[PDB]
Amino acid sequence: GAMTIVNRIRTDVVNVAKSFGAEYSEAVIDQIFQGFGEKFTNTGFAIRVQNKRNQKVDCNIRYGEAKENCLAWDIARESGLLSDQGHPVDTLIQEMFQAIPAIAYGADFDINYGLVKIWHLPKIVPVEEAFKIPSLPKSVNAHIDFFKKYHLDALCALTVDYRNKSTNLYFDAHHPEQRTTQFYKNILQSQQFEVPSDEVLEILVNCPEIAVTFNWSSPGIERMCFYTAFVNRETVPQHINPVLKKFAQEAPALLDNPGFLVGWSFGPKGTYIKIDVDYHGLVVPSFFHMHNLPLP
Ligand SMILES: [C-]#[N+]/C=C\c1c[nH]c2ccccc12
């Protein structure tokens, strides 16, 4: 009935989790919302489901805003959501904000765990700017030639994953070679990752954003992910996977006509789909704008 926007969001988040069989902790949800509920109501907020092989669907909630400072860090620290682990991740987001000016930041939470990531969004810069950051995994610098080969020259975001102890570099996929299916075959084969069906490859050619995941325990790329946006429910490729169908059709949004972001993740494990509902309708236009693309 009548309720605050933040209570509407909470209810919708729990409803999604229940519908998809995702695990969640009431204590963790309350802890997240105490700190971040107001942000969720007023900024680009999204609810994500993802379907890792041979395990339950995970439900994540996330937001971003156009502020130059990493406001999530202070909030997560005071909320009890971000304790030091004695690890490179502890100072990494701080180092990112020192090394490269941000135009925005964000955060991501798994409702059965807590804070998973904090994001740094600069203006698009040369990838080499990242090599200033002291605690980046050594594997990142070692992949300089790989980045050049696959036209991963234009860094558009960075994230720290405190749970997984990993970091992602995100690239603006501007190059015309990235509009070809062969690019995606090649980049996946380069890491011995499985190549998806032709149908999926034909979707990937519209991807504006590529993520590459690195970690401190291994010299290689952990996984990579290709992001594609769809401006309404009906244009999500629902036929590809039952979770896409169900979430496109049923995901809650406060706006009556939301878009979606879908991430196609690949790894050696690492291979699955992520789908976010643009709950207030702010995320998908922002995504096109940050990639210098007209809105579809
Ligand atoms: C990762 N990635 C790319 C975009 C994205 C997906 N969900 C949300 C939510 C709020 C802002 C950006 C955003």
From Swiss-Prot:
Q: Which GO terms describe its molecular function?
A: prenyltransferase activity
Q: Has UniProt tagged this entry with the keyword Transferase? A: yes
Transmembrane regions? none
Annotated residues that bind dimethylallyl diphosphate are located at R48, R62, K117, N168, Y170, R223, Y227, K274
EC numbers for this chain: 2.5.1.159
Quickly give the catalysed reaction.
Answer: hapalindole G + dimethylallyl diphosphate = ambiguine A + diphosphate; hapalindole U + dimethylallyl diphosphate + H(+) = ambiguine H + diphosphate
Activity regulation remarks: Activity is slightly increased in the presence of Mg(2+).
The Swiss-Prot or TrEMBL note on domains reads:
Hapalindole A and hapalindole U are fixed in the same hydrophobic binding pocket, but they adopt completely different orientations, which define reverse or normal prenylation.
Q: Which family does it belong to?
A: Belongs to the aromatic prenyltransferase family.
Name assigned to this protein? Hapalindole dimethylallyltransferase
What does the record give as the organism's lineage? Answer: Bacteria, Bacillati, Cyanobacteriota, Cyanophyceae, Nostocales
Tell me the name of the encoding gene.
ambP3
